Ligand binder design. Sequence first.
Ligand SMILES: Nc1ncnc2c1ncn2[C@@H]1O[C@H](COP(=O)(O)OP(=O)(O)OP(=O)(O)O)[C@@H](O)[C@H]1O
Ligand SMILES: Nc1ncnc2c1ncn2[C@@H]1O[C@H](COP(=O)(O)OP(=O)(O)OP(=O)(O)O)[C@@H](O)[C@H]1O
Ligand SMILES: [Mg+2]
Ligand SMILES: [Mg+2]
Ligand SMILES: [Zn+2]
Lengths: 436, 633
Amino acid sequence: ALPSIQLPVDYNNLFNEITDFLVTFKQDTEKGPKYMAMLQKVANRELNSVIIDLDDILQYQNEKFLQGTQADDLVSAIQQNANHFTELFCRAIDNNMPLPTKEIDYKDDVLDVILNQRRLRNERMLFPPNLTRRYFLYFKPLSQNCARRYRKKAISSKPLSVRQIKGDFLGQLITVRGIITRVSDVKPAVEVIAYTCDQCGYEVFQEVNSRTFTPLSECTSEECSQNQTKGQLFMSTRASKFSAFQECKIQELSQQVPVGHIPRSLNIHVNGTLVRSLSPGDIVDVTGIFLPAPYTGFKALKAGLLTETYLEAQFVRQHKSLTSDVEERVMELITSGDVYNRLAKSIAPEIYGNLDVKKALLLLLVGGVDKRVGDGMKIRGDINVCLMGDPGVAKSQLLKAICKISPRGVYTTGKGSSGVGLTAAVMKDPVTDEMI
Amino acid sequence: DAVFGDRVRRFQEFLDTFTSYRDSVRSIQVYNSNNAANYNDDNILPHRIIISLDDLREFDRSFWSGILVEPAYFIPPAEKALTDLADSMDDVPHPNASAVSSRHPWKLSFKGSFGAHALSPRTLTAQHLNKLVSVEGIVTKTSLVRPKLIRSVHYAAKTGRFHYRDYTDATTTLTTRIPTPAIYPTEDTEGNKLTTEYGYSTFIDHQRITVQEMPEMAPAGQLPRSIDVILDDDLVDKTKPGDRVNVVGVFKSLGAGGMNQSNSNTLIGFKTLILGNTVYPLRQMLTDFDIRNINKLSKKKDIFDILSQSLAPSIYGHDHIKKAILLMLMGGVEKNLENGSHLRGDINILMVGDPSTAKSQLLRFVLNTASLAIATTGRGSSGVGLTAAVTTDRETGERRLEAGAMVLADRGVVCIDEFDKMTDVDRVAIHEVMEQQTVTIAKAGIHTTLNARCSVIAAANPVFGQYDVNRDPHQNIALPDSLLSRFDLLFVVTDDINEIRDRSISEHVLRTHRYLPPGYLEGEPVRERLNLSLAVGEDPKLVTIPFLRKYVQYAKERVIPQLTQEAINVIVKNYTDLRNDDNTKKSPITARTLETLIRLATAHAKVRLSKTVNKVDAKVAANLLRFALLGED
DNA sequence: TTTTTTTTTTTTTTTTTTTTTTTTTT
DNA sequence: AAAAAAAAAAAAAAAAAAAAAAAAAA
Ligand SMILES: Nc1ncnc2c1ncn2[C@@H]1O[C@H](COP(=O)(O)OP(=O)(O)OP(=O)(O)O)[C@@H](O)[C@H]1O
Ligand SMILES: Nc1ncnc2c1ncn2[C@@H]1O[C@H](COP(=O)(O)OP(=O)(O)OP(=O)(O)O)[C@@H](O)[C@H]1O
Ligand SMILES: [Mg+2]
Ligand SMILES: [Mg+2]
Ligand SMILES: [Zn+2]
């Protein structure tokens, strides 16, 4: 049948150490445990996310080493395998959840009403725990500073590329540096599905751990055990638990591509409160778990043993107003004096000359009055500046440079691409094949 | 069974007979071991050795014959013995968290003489199946790298033990076995739920490349043929399209071949593939003798003249163009500047001239002598064929991009012939590549910027049959001004009738046409066929071409000169003198001439093997550009 | 005036593969 | 309860070649 192999890791001692770390850990630098404070904060319906730090876990390991008792190197176990430790930590959080200390505040929560209505009928006359959960659990990659402080090296936070991601890193926690190109809308993904049964017993719950599932449509309760054909199950959306899901694509930076090659791309999946952290056009450093997609359905047979892949995201590090500060900056620049000439001159300091052109580009940067006259008359305040002249006079640096100053600007060129008049009403977007 | 163990014993004896392989195993092992111990690191060598078939031939003729003739029954026994030896060497323990599950077995590679097993994608037939072969060719297409599952590990609740399932495929192993459905087990033998534990399983990278025959060796009236090679593990991404490669592997059949439930048909045959063991590129490593000779030849005063004259010794004259080509070979230093800009370091040359003036025989020479070169013809090219094309990956199913001529020659040269005969829609694309050195693709949901840093040498003809001196230069050249501004040196060459020139050039041509290759008799036709013997062993003064290639490589990779003030003083005076004069030049002078002087000075500085730009470099650049623009020679 | 030039307009799917999962049928 | 048979699952599309018009000029 299925042969058996011996592996060093045992999850019992790991669970014991997680339970010890949640209670014992204190920030050495409020007093007391670091995480039981934020758990109490969560219990008051205020915090929606729980973020664990592996620097903190190393701190607990270092405390135990100061005591001298052996440890299970939890930080390495998390790095090598992280899809199971999420469930372990969720169970550990569920076991030690503090009581609501203040402001219970039950107002109109449908799930709350359902759960409260369950109690009376069940007691007067076991469900999946994830239904009662609200917090989301994320890991935080290691820090080189803390690592160098205690050696031990580091692998999870190293800024790899899309190309350096081999098949040997699957099932681990790694970090990838790139630029975000495409981001999709937020849609709900089912986690626990509740079926209502023709006043037969009560609603049944099923968990979904894949991208594809099958409805139950058969009532198995004790009262529903009667033989008469009676009808299948109907889904109830209100008693079911959903989640926010988003998918993005990250592309390799031009600096890291070798000569003669084409850049690759990677897929990122994000669930929870971390959704909407990434937008198109951002250069970011994303940490997560690298997992194999099932690739099932059609065109799975031809591949046979070939799989897709994706990255479950858990952390985001983006590389890069009226206040008294900006109220004083303008006064400082006024006291500086020579605003006109200096403003014109500092525009593209590489190019020497054409100072009147630089004066005019300033006037183009500012806008004239747009006054809406009655009876339909309108007058424009925008500026139309054309610059003619012989080739090789710095024609096309001046322009590019002006685009930098104003955020709202587009550099459109000749017939290589059609963007000036592309006010088209048809868009064959591959995702859905409908017009935009 | 018994034969397997006997062959393992034979290979084990072979391994301790020759101690070199045992030393290489230890070197790799100690490197990998002491690399992981460097916590303050500044990467991992694969488990693969290269053995020579020759030594095995003297050791055991039977085993060598078995490997060459019946690889599928002699390679797996050898790999197990190599793994056993490697395991015996590693005395230090490695109680790693997850390396215990994945052993990464050692593999083998071959070299030496293959005899009659050295073939090409055309001479490979059904007689060579299940044999060890080597094929020479050019890579055309590659597939995307995907991960493939080899072993899955599952954890069982209520018991605490693990269970593993193994997977095999036709392309994975050399022996046919019962296939696997690649579905993860969900139920234990006792019915306990099983949970898949990624991070303990095994995945291997997989790629497929296509190798085509060299078009120069094809028979008359026939198109070149191609074959498919599958690469795995550590052989991935060692080749790129356009490369010339030699792949050693096992020629194998696959599938059912239409002898099955499907209808009987004469059009259905079997599918053939190669499981590559080794890939060899057909970078010239330099010894100390070569470097010492280069440094000794650098100090000679008239080195630029010798280097320029050594180019194309079968062309009479055209000294200045040959100097310009040499300066192209040793490009300038590229400067990365703020606002996301870069000053180009490439030198671009255009040649306009009369018919039969040896314009096209210099492009062919540049194709051969340079490290990377791509040939293009004006009328037989398209815009989508120069920048990139949207295609599909059959093996995996996505939509991808395929490189064109310009982007395939990154850090190389592109030689375009009949440049004026190119259509306008075609000529816009080359404009962008000449200006930004980048390609923008925004088609079919693929939004990408591609790097293309190539040097352009081009040849064209005037509007009429021959150059006219009684008409303005712009009337003679049909090319637009915007395109014409992007060339550093424009050379107008004219054939003038003179008796002494004719007497010399006719003598040179007649001397050239009377050359006999060594080993050929008079009247014996040249047998440019090689008789299917592709290779014997499978892996005033002028200078020889390979020495020139070594010189160019060393100069490009070892010296980066910087500009100096005293050279700038010469450059500025030359620029000011040239700008303010009434001489009628064949091309207008603009503010981009200064950059051309700087680039030519940098190239001449590289030629001298020096780290600074001197006054002599500025003088040489000035003389070259004065000849180009004026003809004052 | 009769030559050259120019946009531009359909051209596309007829086929595939062995699993995997369903209904009939002894 | 255990066999034999029968479908779903396609998707996709740019890139090039040939022919007839409706605007330009020695
Ligand atoms: N006043 C100036 N100051 C500095 N550099 C200048 C000046 N005028 C021209 N240049 C030079 O001109 C170049 C910038 O303009 P460039 O010739 O590239 O584009 P352009 O003027 O749009 O011409 P083209 O028609 O060739 O595209 C640089 O080499 C720059 O040094
Ligand atoms: N200077 C020369 N030395 C040696 N051979 C020459 C020379 N000039 C021309 N030839 C010979 O003239 C023939 C044609 O030359 P080639 O094809 O290079 O001309 P081209 O400039 O490309 O012509 P076209 O304008 O017709 O395209 C070749 O046989 C070449 O060897
Ligand atoms: Mg410009
Ligand atoms: Mg020619
Ligand atoms: Zn019921």
